[PDB]
Amino acid sequence: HHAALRQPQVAELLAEARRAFREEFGAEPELAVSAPGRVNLIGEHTDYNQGLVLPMALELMTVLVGSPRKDGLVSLLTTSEGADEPQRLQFPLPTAQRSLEPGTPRWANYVKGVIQYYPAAPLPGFSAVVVSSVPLGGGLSSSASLEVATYTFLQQLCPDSGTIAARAQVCQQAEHSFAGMPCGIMDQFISLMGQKGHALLIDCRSLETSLVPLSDPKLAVLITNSNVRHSLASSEYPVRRRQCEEVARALGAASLREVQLEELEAARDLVSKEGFRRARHVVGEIRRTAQAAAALRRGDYRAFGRLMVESHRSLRDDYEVSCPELDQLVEAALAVPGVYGSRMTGGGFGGCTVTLLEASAAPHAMRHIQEHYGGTATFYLSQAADGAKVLCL
Ligand SMILES: O=C1CCCC2=C1C1(CCCCC1)N=C(Nc1nc3ccccc3o1)N2
Ligand SMILES: OC[C@H]1O[C@@H](O)[C@H](O)[C@@H](O)[C@H]1O
């Protein structure tokens, strides 16, 4: 099997969500919102180091459809097959007396976290159906898209008077506290600020962002899901953060963004062998991401793709967050004529690779990758998509 997976269009997700809502609450929902998943083109394990990242939002998205309530109740239904039980859930709005807490089902910890830290009041209660085409925990940020869709819904109930970064950070806080995943800010930011036909260069120190056109009929972004997820993934992520902090402290730096590749080379003995390799990835990856944005600006897909491949080797050998399945998928992809570059994307230890290629080479690329992969790969061909949006029903 080597054809791209169906990507449900928005009209399909809306129809499903409204049918599930009518059938469950006996009336037509009044509001719809959505927020997408994402793929990171380059700039991996840099966001929590205040570095640069270059993601784009995907046509895979999460949809909320719902209505405000007057009884201070939050009533949730999700139609997503792989969400853990129960898929119906209710709880009253938190107060200074009773705050929400992480519990079961896990998929609602994302919604609760966001309601809990939502910065404006008064928030009414609401009824809402959650649908999503983002493969749950597939490495394309299903949780961030649920958080951001929830945030975008709350804004319709109680407008915040805030900024995009504040919203991303609310959603990042929910991830940290209600899901126990100490992520950076990239996934929430792109889900919030994506735009069709654009990648988003995010400066995670200044919080400056740039919408870089990424729309060329002859260019494709191929996402390949390894469909494996090593247990190591969850546990090594904080180990990598902590190794990064060690090097930053040793160089007297607020973060590794403040550390130049040449300052690192000059301070080997102040840090371990492993910590040095981890910082060398991060420092070089920040520089590669800036160079990739420039390459994209001039339409230099060959240079962009070479930087991707250097990003992969750095992640495999210096940061050690790849795995044999990702490495095989990358090497397979790079043997296909028309492919500019390929690399793991997201956190690592499983999940997806991202491949930049000539659009006409996509059918060959998918066949060749599948035939040279010991597992069962899944594929997405995605254009750069919109971030969070609202449709009044
Ligand atoms: O178990 C893990 C491990 C860490 C990554 C991750 C999860 C699970 C969360 C619990 C249910 C299945 C998997 N879900 C997400 N994201 C997500 N779940 C959603 C449910 C409905 C709508 C949109 C959703 O996005 N991420
Ligand atoms: O670049 C690695 C990325 O891994 C993601 O899973 C994480 O949520 C992001 O914040 C980023 O750190």
Numbering used by the authors: 0 to 392
Describing publication, verbatim:
GALK1 is a small molecule kinase of the GHMP kinase family, which catalyzes the MgATP-dependent phosphorylation of the C-1 hydroxyl of α-d-galactose to yield Gal-1-P in the Leloir pathway. In classic galactosemia, GALT enzymatic deficiency causes the accumulation of Gal-1-P, the product of the enzyme galactokinase 1 (GALK1; EC 2.7.1.6) upstream of GALT in the Leloir pathway. Inhibition of human GALK1 (hGALK1) to prevent Gal-1-P production therefore could provide a therapeutic benefit for GALT deficiency. Here, we determined crystal structures of hGALK1 bound with reported ATP-competitive inhibitors of the spiro-benzoxazole series, to reveal their binding mode in the active site.
To this end, we co-crystallized hGALK1 with two spiro-benzoxazole inhibitors (T1 and T2), in the presence of galactose, and determined their crystal structures to 2.44 and 2.10 Å resolution, respectively. T1 and T2 share the chemical scaffold of a benzoxazole ring connected to a tetrahydroquinazolinone ring by an amide linker, and both compounds are found to occupy the ATP binding site in a similar manner. The benzoxazole ring, mimicking the adenine moiety of ATP, sits in a hydrophobic pocket forming a π–π stacking interaction with Trp106 and van der Waals interactions with Val129 and Leu145. Importantly, the quinazolinone cyclohexanone and spiro-ring substituents cause displacement of two key side-chains—Arg105 and Arg228—at the entrance of the ATP site. In our costructures, both Arg105 and Arg228 are sequestered away from the ATP phosphate groups, to accommodate the quinazolinone ring of the compounds. For T2 with the larger spiro ring, the carbonyl moiety is close enough to hydrogen bond with the Arg105 guanidino side chain (dotted line). Therefore, these residues are sequestered away from catalysis in the inhibitor-bound complexes. ATP-titration experiments with T2 showed no significant change in Vmaxapp (P = 0.1801) and a significant increase in Kmapp (P < 0.0001), collectively indicating competitive inhibition with ATP by T2, which is supported by fitting in GraphPad Prism and is in agreement with its binding mode in our hGALK1 crystal costructure. We found that hGALK1 co-crystallized with galactose and T2 produced the required quantity (crystals in the hundreds) and diffraction quality (consistently better than 2.5 Å) for the screening campaign. To bias hits toward allosteric binding, we soaked compounds into hGALK1 co-crystals with galactose and T2 occupying the active site.
